């Protein structure tokens, strides 16, 4: 239970820094093409084209937290930049997990 | 004030320059002209 974190730590220390290069590439299409084509697309596919909507969903289903979130776009090398971002954020008292 | 349970970060950075919350004069609001955001924005900054 990710809530187990809220034994040892306050709601505001579980941070979330998951990023991507473009991410949401599928909704991104439904917006710029599937809709101009008049195919049946959701009304909110805009929601799901943002890099940080993934991140958000993680927080809305698992770890309900008032933690920092900084989602990066470092193209091919995103995943590492994310480690950096998360690293630094943790080394500034912003969060522990 | 890093991780100080007895010092809110707002206090912290303000106190480091010799100020309390009373010196926070202007609050710049997101305030998007939408229904919920403005009732909420005010709220958060208020409670704080």
């Amino acid at each position: 239970d990710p809530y187990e974190f809220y034994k040892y730590v306050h709601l505001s220390e579980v941070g979330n820094c998951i990023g991507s290069g473009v991410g949401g590439t599928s909704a991104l299409r439904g917006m710029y093409k599937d809709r101009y084509l008049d195919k049946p697309v959701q009304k909110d596919i805009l929601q799901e084209s943002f890099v940080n909507t993934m991140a958000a969903w993680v927080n809305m289903l698992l770890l309900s937290s008032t933690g920092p979130i900084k989602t990066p776009v470092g193209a091919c090398a995103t995943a590492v930049e994310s480690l950096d971002v998360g690293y630094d954020t943790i080394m500034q008292g912003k969060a522990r997990v | 004030w890093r991780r100080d349970s007895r010092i809110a970060p707002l206090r912290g950075a303000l106190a480091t320059w010799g100020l309390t919350i009373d010196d926070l004069g202007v609050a710049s609001f997101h305030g998007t002209s939408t229904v919920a955001n403005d009732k909420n924005e005010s709220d958060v900054i208020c409670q704080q």
Binding site: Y3, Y6, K7, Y8, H10, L11, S12 | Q47
Partner: peptide
């Protein structure tokens, strides 16, 4: 946290979840 507590939990930098009477994790009233 139950909704009524939210503001308090958010502001008490030591408020932490306790084990509960089903096994669920909950901030106490």
């Amino acid at each position: 946290y139950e909704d009524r507590i939210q503001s308090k939990v958010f502001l008490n930098p030591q408020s932490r979840v306790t084990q509960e009477s089903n096994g669920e994790l909950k901030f106490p009233a």
